[PDB]
Design an enzyme around this catalytic site. Structure first.
Site, PDB file in Angstrom:
ATOM      1  N   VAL A   5       3.404  35.525 -30.278  1.00  0.00           N
ATOM      2  CA  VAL A   5       2.576  36.579 -29.687  1.00  0.00           C
ATOM      3  C   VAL A   5       2.990  36.736 -28.234  1.00  0.00           C
ATOM      4  O   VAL A   5       2.949  35.767 -27.476  1.00  0.00           O
ATOM      5  CB  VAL A   5       1.089  36.190 -29.763  1.00  0.00           C
ATOM      6  CG1 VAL A   5       0.195  37.257 -29.063  1.00  0.00           C
ATOM      7  CG2 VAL A   5       0.655  35.994 -31.189  1.00  0.00           C
ATOM      8  N   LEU A   6       3.299  37.972 -27.816  1.00  0.00           N
ATOM      9  CA  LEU A   6       3.618  38.237 -26.422  1.00  0.00           C
ATOM     10  C   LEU A   6       2.335  38.341 -25.626  1.00  0.00           C
ATOM     11  O   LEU A   6       1.348  38.901 -26.103  1.00  0.00           O
ATOM     12  CB  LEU A   6       4.296  39.599 -26.308  1.00  0.00           C
ATOM     13  CG  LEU A   6       5.697  39.771 -26.854  1.00  0.00           C
ATOM     14  CD1 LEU A   6       6.159  41.221 -26.587  1.00  0.00           C
ATOM     15  CD2 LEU A   6       6.566  38.756 -26.192  1.00  0.00           C
ATOM     16  N   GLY A   7       2.348  37.747 -24.441  1.00  0.00           N
ATOM     17  CA  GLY A   7       1.279  38.012 -23.483  1.00  0.00           C
ATOM     18  C   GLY A   7       1.832  38.630 -22.216  1.00  0.00           C
ATOM     19  O   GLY A   7       2.778  38.100 -21.623  1.00  0.00           O
ATOM     20  N   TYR A   8       1.248  39.758 -21.777  1.00  0.00           N
ATOM     21  CA  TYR A   8       1.688  40.440 -20.567  1.00  0.00           C
ATOM     22  C   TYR A   8       0.521  40.714 -19.631  1.00  0.00           C
ATOM     23  O   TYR A   8       0.737  41.215 -18.526  1.00  0.00           O
ATOM     24  CB  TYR A   8       2.452  41.747 -20.881  1.00  0.00           C
ATOM     25  CG  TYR A   8       1.605  42.726 -21.605  1.00  0.00           C
ATOM     26  CD1 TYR A   8       0.833  43.639 -20.910  1.00  0.00           C
ATOM     27  CD2 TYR A   8       1.584  42.773 -22.981  1.00  0.00           C
ATOM     28  CE1 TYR A   8       0.040  44.516 -21.544  1.00  0.00           C
ATOM     29  CE2 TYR A   8       0.803  43.702 -23.643  1.00  0.00           C
ATOM     30  CZ  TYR A   8       0.027  44.591 -22.912  1.00  0.00           C
ATOM     31  OH  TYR A   8      -0.749  45.517 -23.565  1.00  0.00           O
ATOM     32  N   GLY A   9      -0.703  40.417 -20.053  1.00  0.00           N
ATOM     33  CA  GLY A   9      -1.913  40.661 -19.265  1.00  0.00           C
ATOM     34  C   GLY A   9      -2.756  39.413 -19.299  1.00  0.00           C
ATOM     35  O   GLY A   9      -2.245  38.337 -18.952  1.00  0.00           O
ATOM     36  N   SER A  10      -4.026  39.528 -19.697  1.00  0.00           N
ATOM     37  CA  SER A  10      -4.912  38.380 -19.642  1.00  0.00           C
ATOM     38  C   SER A  10      -4.515  37.268 -20.578  1.00  0.00           C
ATOM     39  O   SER A  10      -4.978  36.160 -20.366  1.00  0.00           O
ATOM     40  CB  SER A  10      -6.379  38.759 -19.883  1.00  0.00           C
ATOM     41  OG  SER A  10      -6.576  39.281 -21.180  1.00  0.00           O
ATOM     42  N   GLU A 110     -10.049  42.631 -22.903  1.00  0.00           N
ATOM     43  CA  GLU A 110      -9.880  44.075 -22.914  1.00  0.00           C
ATOM     44  C   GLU A 110      -9.451  44.475 -24.323  1.00  0.00           C
ATOM     45  O   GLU A 110      -8.614  43.802 -24.949  1.00  0.00           O
ATOM     46  CB  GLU A 110      -8.758  44.415 -21.934  1.00  0.00           C
ATOM     47  CG  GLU A 110      -8.968  43.769 -20.527  1.00  0.00           C
ATOM     48  CD  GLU A 110      -8.606  42.266 -20.426  1.00  0.00           C
ATOM     49  OE1 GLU A 110      -7.686  41.705 -21.089  1.00  0.00           O
ATOM     50  OE2 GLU A 110      -9.243  41.571 -19.625  1.00  0.00           O
TER      51      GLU A 110
END
Length: 223
Positions: A5-10, A110
């Site tokens: 899973v990519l995370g780019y924010g929270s 979000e």
């Protein structure tokens, strides 16, 4: 078996449960912009905030305003290929026993207008994690059209068609909103500051010029 899973924010600083790898990543092929409105976390229905989304290369090149905005902040301007786009983030591995929880990760963050996508992505990482990334790539051996190794990943994106998408927006426009908004999770400024903190904890030096200009402008409005 499991999923990456990519995370780019929270998800960078508030990780998903039960991950067994967390690899700092230069994610190619997407630009990150604060072009998604928030009405339940960092703003309200009547006064929305601004939170992060990723825009893929193929959408950027199809709108002049997106392309000029990406070129304004890219060290590879004028960009010529998806590899020219870089977003600094992370990638998590979720074992099979927990992979089905991925479909519920937004329930605590979000969420309005985000959709779940599966994409093959070209990633790079630091020396400390190169071997770990190399092992990840060797499980489902995949290469792109340029012969580079890519990882099959899931990512949550506010696409250009979603109800909460507000792009394109200039840094000045976005900053004016971030500087005044807040919702049940706290101020919109705190969301930006937490993302900047998390990226600074993760030196790979690759920097995000858009996020730097956004934070500088928000600070000018708050001063």
């Amino acid at each position: 078996s499991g999923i990456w899973v990519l995370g780019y924010g929270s998800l960078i600083y508030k990780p998903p449960s039960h991950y067994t790898h967390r690899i700092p990543a230069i994610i190619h092929g997407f630009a990150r912009r604060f072009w998604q409105s928030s009405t339940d976390h960092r703003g309200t229905p009547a006064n929305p905030g601004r939170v992060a989304t990723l825009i893929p290369y193929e959408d950027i090149i199809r709108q002049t305003a997106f392309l000029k905005n990406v070129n304004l902040y890219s060290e590879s301007a004028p960009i010529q290929d998806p590899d020219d786009l870089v977003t600094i983030g992370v990638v998590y591995y979720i074992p099979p026993e927990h992979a089905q929880e991925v479909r519920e990760y937004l329930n605590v963050r979000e969420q309005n207008g985000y959709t779940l996508h599966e994409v093959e992505v070209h990633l790079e990482t630091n020396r400390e994690h190169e071997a770990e990334l190399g092992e990840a790539l060797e499980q489902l051996p995949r290469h792109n059209k340029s012969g580079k190794r890519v990882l099959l990943t899931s990512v949550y994106i506010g696409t250009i068609d979603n109800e909460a998408f507000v792009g394109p927006e200039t840094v000045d426009e976005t900053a004016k909103v971030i500087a005044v908004s807040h919702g049940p999770s706290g101020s919109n400024y705190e969301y930006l500051a937490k993302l900047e903190q998390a990226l600074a904890q993760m030196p790979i030096r690759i920097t995000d010029h858009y996020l730097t200009a956004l934070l500088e402008t928000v600070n000018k409005y708050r001063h």
